Write a protein that binds this ligand. Structure first.
Ligand SMILES: Nc1ncnc2c1ncn2[C@@H]1O[C@H](COP(=O)(O)OP(=O)(O)O)[C@@H](O)[C@H]1O
Ligand SMILES: [Cl-]
Ligand SMILES: [Mg+2]
Ligand SMILES: [Mg+2]
Lengths: 5, 19, 355
């Protein structure tokens, strides 16, 4: 779950 | 994860396990 | 393009290193060795070399920042799984763009090897604990030297070649180039391996969260099961406090200042020697306490961990594997991965290792 745009 | 709500749950859990 | 020979799949793929110079790549013997919501993972045989590869297929166009391809292209280390090629193709969802990552195939993982010893009720021999933990810290030292944080360290992401005892770090789908002063997602690790600052919802953490996850892995290997289990963040935090004791106000401020003014009950710390079995080596316990620290800056750096006395056996010139083979490469440090502490090369490189 990478950083949200 | 509001710190107020999170801390309350953690305190309630730690009190139960505390000696 | 798919043509007969076994079925031979031919694609024009870009090599991981160097500038973009795509070349035709042929492979066959496709089979699924994994599957998840991220995409599909395949095994393949390269037609030219015959070498086995893994093809991670994902949909790298989503809301989340997808840094996986760009991070892996910069990585070249013996303890990090190599990205041979990457290409694009149509996926299961029609009209969609799926990224294909061709990596070196590695048969096992630390989790799978550890689970066998748990099932057999044995304990993983300390030589493997030293070997596996040492190579993970080398990989972390390498990625951290570029400012990259893995953010998903755990046994399932540590690939093993049991013949050579070589460990390869993988699963860079959560890694990020951490920027000092730019907030980050706080839900970035996995269950049982999230550092306490992450559990407290911190968005200003650093690469030291990887060091905490390494300590969780180290304790898990010594223990036979995860040390801080629990479905929720409170559950896992209760496990941590029950071992480490209640964090101090200064320690809480080091993790997340928003919690400094709450009255957490004071729980006594459980001594490390009582956490593990009586047969546990003292230096493993010593290394573990310097990894699982509340204050993120107090945790050892990955390079410092490799210099720990627990890994002194690996630096022995006459050290050999249980199966008889010589140990893998361990002292071929580059100046890049020695950047954080060049003087550590006195300990990291034993006198026999220099030719
Ligand atoms: N190069 C590889 N060779 C063999 N197995 C792999 C490889 N990469 C990943 N795997 C397997 O796939 C599983 C998922 O890891 P990975 O695909 O890297 O990330 P994610 O879990 O996000 O899909 C791992 O448990 C691992 O066993
Ligand atoms: Cl054909
Ligand atoms: Mg994984
Ligand atoms: Mg992932």
């Amino acid at each position: 779950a990478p950083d949200l745009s | 994860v509001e710190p107020q709500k999170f801390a309350e749950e953690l305190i309630h859990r730690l009190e139960a396990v505390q000696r | 393009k798919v043509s007969r020979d076994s079925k031979v799949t031919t694609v024009v793929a870009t090599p991981g290193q160097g500038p973009d110079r795509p070349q035709e790549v042929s492979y066959t013997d496709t089979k699924v060795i994994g599957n998840g919501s991220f995409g599909v993972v395949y095994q393949a045989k390269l037609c030219d070399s015959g070498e086995l590869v893994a093809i991670k297929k994902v949909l790298q166009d989503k809301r989340f920042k997808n840094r996986e391809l760009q991070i892996m292209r910069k990585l070249d280390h013996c303890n990090i799984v190599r990205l041979r090629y990457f290409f694009y193709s149509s996926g299961e969802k029609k009209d969609e763009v799926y990224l294909n990552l061709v990596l070196d195939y590695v048969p096992e993982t630390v989790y799978r090897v550890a689970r066998h010893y748990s099932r057999a009720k044995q304990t993983l021999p300390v030589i493997y604990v030293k070997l596996y933990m040492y190579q993970l810290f080398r990989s972390l030292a390498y990625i951290h030297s570029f400012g990259i944080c893995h953010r998903d360290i755990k046994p399932q992401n540590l690939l093993l070649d049991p013949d050579t005892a070589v460990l390869k770090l993988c699963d860079f789908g959560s890694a990020k180039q951490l920027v000092r002063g730019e907030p980050n997602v706080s839900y970035i690790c996995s269950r049982y391996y999230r550092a306490p600052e992450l559990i407290f919802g911190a968005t200003d953490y650093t690469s030291s969260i990887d060091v905490w996850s390494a300590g969780c892995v180290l304790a898990e290997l010594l223990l036979g099961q995860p040390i801080f289990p629990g479905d929720s963040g409170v559950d896992q935090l209760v496990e941590i406090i029950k071992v480490l004791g209640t964090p101090t106000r200064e320690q809480i401020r080091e993790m997340n200042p928003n919690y400094t003014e709450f009255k957490f009950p004071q729980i006594k710390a459980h001594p490390w020697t009582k956490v593990f079995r009586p047969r546990t080596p003292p230096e493993a316990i010593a290394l573990c306490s310097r990894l699982l620290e509340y204050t993120p800056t107090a945790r050892l750096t990955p390079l410092e961990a490799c210099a720990h006395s627990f890994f002194d056996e690996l630096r022995d010139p006459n050290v050999k594997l249980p199966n008889g083979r010589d140990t893998p490469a361990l002292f071929n440090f580059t100046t890049q991965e020695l950047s954080s502490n060049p003087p550590l090369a006195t300990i990291l490189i034993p006198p026999h290792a220099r030719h």
